[PDB]
Swiss-Prot record:
Changing residue 185 to A: Impaired interaction with SQSTM1/p62. Belongs to the KEAP1 family. The record marks 111 as: Sensor for electrophilic agents. This is Kelch-like ECH-associated protein 1. The gene is Keap1. Disruption phenotype: Early postnatal lethality caused by abnormal cornification. Mice survive until weaning and probably die from malnutrition resulting from hyperkeratosis in the esophagus and forestomach that cause gastric obstruction. Defects are caused by constitutive activation Nfe2l2/Nrf2, leading to constitutive expression of phase 2 detoxifying enzymes. Mice lacking both Nfe2l2/Nrf2 and Keap1 reverse the hyperkeratosis phenotype and are healthy and viable in normal conditions. It comes from Mus musculus (Mouse).
């Protein structure tokens, strides 16, 4: 009990500093301490009850600064603190956690599209590079299942991608997996039960409402019910056996919609609205502040 869905940063006209937390048990939203630096295209994650904001970019009227930052938010104090910075700026990043360690995957620095990957050790407050992906990927979806790290879709600088790959930590090695049925850049990627879900994204022509899942045992991708809204650059997380998607861009509006997927009924429902429409957020779940 007592866990909230935290959304950090995002974009609407410029990069945002908002930290806001949604309580699925009562429908309430709380506005919490702003990020020290506004950022869109970041990712969020939680280790040891602390919320981490990783990478992104501050797009403002006066600048476009890609972020190498790792910042940690403690719900017990409602305060952000800087942590060690990554080796390189990573906008449009994906992140995953294995065994208490944060993996930062891909992303962009100016016109550079990274294949590099690095791993953070909270105990030592240190990052170290690991093996790079087989593909350069920005707008890459990342998730962890069974202590394996997956990088899904994205954009390599020339093409949006349906390909996906998996990192095996004990071998420090990446291998391709079955590609998705749909090209997806800027999708929401998460894990639920024994599958990696890829929701939404941009296929090079349109923002998508379709959703597909990779069963790690059978190595197949299967479509599930589509979202109500087409969305790219959405936030995503899992809480109490359901997927939550937050915001994004539908080709017309920066959405405030939050939809929730129930795998037992294979249905999506609209559960709340953010306080304002935005894309490019980082999202994670931890205790209320
Ligand atoms: C263009 C204007 C359309 C409306 C719009 C949408 C979103 C934002 S964002 O600030 O959230 N952002 C903007 C940024 O960093 O370029 C952002 C963050 C994460 C992923 C992505 N993403 N997803 C799909 C694709 C794609 O093209 O394949 C991309 C781009 C190539 C990286 C974008 C701002 C404005």
């Amino acid at each position: 009990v007592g866990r909230l869905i935290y959304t950090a940063g995002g974009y609407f006209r410029q990069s945002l500093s908002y930290l806001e937390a949604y309580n699925p048990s009562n429908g309430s939203w709380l506005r919490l301490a702003d990020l020290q630096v506004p950022r869109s295209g970041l990712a969020g994650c939680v280790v040891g009850g602390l919320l981490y904001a990783v990478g992104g970019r501050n797009n403002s009227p006066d600048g476009n600064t890609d972020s190498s930052a790792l910042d940690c938010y403690n719900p017990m104090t409602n305060q952000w603190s800087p942590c060690a910075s990554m080796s390189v700026p990573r906008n449009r990043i994906g992140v995953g956690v294995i065994d208490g360690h944060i993996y930062a995957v891909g992303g962009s620095h100016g016109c550079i599209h990274h294949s590099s990957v690095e791993r953070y050790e909270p105990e030592r407050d240190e990052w170290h590079l690991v093996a790079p992906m087989l593909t350069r990927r920005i707008g890459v979806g990342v998730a962890v299942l069974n202590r394996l790290l997956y990088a899904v879709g994205g954009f390599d600088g020339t093409n949006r991608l349906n390909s996906a790959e998996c990192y095996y930590p004990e071998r420090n090695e990446w291998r391709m997996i079955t590609p998705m049925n749909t090209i997806r850049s800027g999708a929401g990627v998460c894990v639920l039960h024994n599958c990696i879900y890829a929701a939404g994204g941009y296929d090079g022509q349109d923002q998508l409402n379709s959703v597909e899942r990779y069963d790690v045992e059978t190595e197949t991708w299967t479509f599930v019910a589509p979202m109500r809204h087409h969305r790219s650059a959405l936030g995503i997380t899992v809480h109490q056996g359901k997927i939550y998607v937050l915001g994004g861009y539908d080709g017309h509006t920066f959405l405030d919609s939050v939809e929730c997927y129930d795998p037992d009924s294979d249905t999506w429902s609209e559960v709340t609205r953010m306080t304002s429409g935005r894309s490019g957020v980082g999202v994670a779940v931890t205790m209320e502040p």
